[PDB]
């Protein structure tokens, strides 16, 4: 399933790589990290590669996806798993970092804002939130150009026609917003610094710091 993710997501290495790099420059080797909506655990695995000694908690509503996540980690790896929705109470922590990839765009805008507040509450002072996210263009005219650029990647990756059809169907349930609006929502939630680190049209890695 990993091959398909790279066919569907432009600049996979730049965007996931940027998320790992900003965490590695922000938190200690022994950081406590929550992967929020870990899915099959691609972001969690990339963090473990860079941070062998980090304490990782992988959270998702899907037991099936978390089972595929646990398969990526060695039997003796201390990685922990929690079955929970984004809208459920977050784990107590504290955490040095909270990370998410391609999950929070499924939430209503009001629930995104509430989630940002609840994440800041479980972060230590100076702690980091990182999102690798599907973002809306700021105008309907630019959204058409974002869509053409996404399709150009998908077609050039030789994506099976039925897998792109399935992708389009899943995207009817997306509630994306532009990157600058959700970065401002981090500031509104009390993150003292927020920045867009990397972007490829529809996809972006952004971060907020608690202090
Ligand atoms: N709302 C949600 N809660 C948990 N995991 C998710 N993955 C995608 N959407 C999710
Ligand atoms: Ca989606």
Numbering used by the authors: 18 to 228
Article excerpt on this structure:
Due to the high crystallization tendency of CysGΔN16, subsequent mutagenesis experiments were focused on this variant. This approach enabled the production of both full-length and N-terminal truncated mutants in high purity, which were characterized in activity assays and used for structural studies. Specifically, the C1-carboxyl group of each substrate interacts with Arg22 and the divalent metal ion, while the C4-carboxyl group forms hydrogen bonds with His167 and Arg187. Moreover, Arg22 was found to be important for cosubstrate binding, with the CysGfl-R22K mutant displaying a 44% reduction in activity compared to wt.
Here, we characterize the O-methyltransferases BelI and CysG, which catalyze the initial step of β-lactone formation. Employing techniques such as crystallography, computational analysis, mutagenesis, and activity assays, we identified a His-His-Asp (HHD) motif in the active sites of the two enzymes, which is crucial for binding a catalytically active calcium ion. As expected, BelI as well as CysGΔN16 adopt the class I methyltransferase Rossmann fold, characterized by a core domain of a seven-stranded β-sheet flanked by α-helices. The HHD-motif enables regiospecific C1-carboxy group methylation of their respective malic substrates.
